[PDB]
Amino acid sequence: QRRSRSESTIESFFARGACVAIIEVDNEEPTTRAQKLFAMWRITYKDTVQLRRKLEFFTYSRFDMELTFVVTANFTNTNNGHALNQVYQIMYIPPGAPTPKSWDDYTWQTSSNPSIFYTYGAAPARISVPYVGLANAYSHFYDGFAKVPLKTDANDQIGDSLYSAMTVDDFGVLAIRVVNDHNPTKVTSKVRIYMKPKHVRVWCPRPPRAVPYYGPGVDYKDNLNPLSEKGLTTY
Amino acid sequence: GLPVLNTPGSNQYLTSDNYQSPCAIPEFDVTPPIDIPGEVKNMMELAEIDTMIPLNLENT
C-alpha cells in the first residue's frame, strides 16, 4: 500500500507543543498601584485556544507532561542606567502548600517544594512532569457537582456548589519572582510557559468546539453564526 | 576529559523535538491504567466515521 500512516499517530498529533499562558513580573517598590512583585498563575490548559480545542476532541485521556519556560525583558526609561543580569525563580506549588503573600516570605525557602532557579540569557529551561492524575485518566468535561444540597441542610448557601468542577483548586499553582533586589529603575519581564504532551493515550472522541469560548466552562455568549453564506445550486 | 565541540544549533528551543529532559518529581508512582472502552489508537479512525454534511446555505 506504501502509505505511511505513522505521520498522523496520536504521539505525533500532540507532538507539537504550544503556548498556554503569559505571566508578568516587575521589580520596583510596592506603590499604590498593582504590586507586581510576583505573579501567581492557576495551572490549567484552557487559557489559550490553540491547545484547548486540540485537546477537547477527546473525553478521557492520560498523558505525561513537558514544560518549557521562555523569559524576555525590557526597560521603562530612555537613558536608563545599565542594569545587571537577573535570576528568575519558577517555584511550583501543589495544593495544600501555603500560598506566598509577599516578596520574601518563609515559604519561598523551597523547603521541599521543587523549583527551578533560572538564569536569564541562557537556554530555555526544559523540565518534565509525569502523570499526576489521581484517577486512571484526566477528565476533560466533567459533568456533575462536587457537593449536593441535601434536604435537611442549614440553608441553601452552604450546600450550593459550582457546575462542572471536580476540584476548587485544579492541580496547584505556579509562582514567579525575581531573586535580585529592588532598584530605582524597573525591568518589566514577561514569561511564556510552553507545554508539550508526550505518551498520549485517549478515549471516546467527541466533536470539536466551533463557536468561540467564553470563560473556563462549556458555555457561550457571542458570535452565534458559525457558517458563511453560499448559494445552493451554484458551485 | 573529552574534546567536545559546540555544533551549530545549540541553545535553540525548537517547538518540535524529542530530546531528553530531567524529571521534576522523581521516584514517583504511576497510577496503573485500566480498560476504558473506546480506545482511539490513531487519528485516522475519526475521518472514517459516518458524519453529516450541511448543504443548504441560503440567506434565510
Binding site: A15, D64, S128, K198, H199 | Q20, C23, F28
Partner: peptide
C-alpha cells in the same frame, strides 16, 4: 539503518517517543 537509543534517566516518564 537504525539509530542509537539510551534512556539516560532512571525516571520512566522523562524519555521520548
Amino acid at each position: 539503518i537504525n539509530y542509537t537509543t539510551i534512556n539516560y534517566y532512571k525516571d520512566s516518564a522523562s524519555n521520548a517517543a
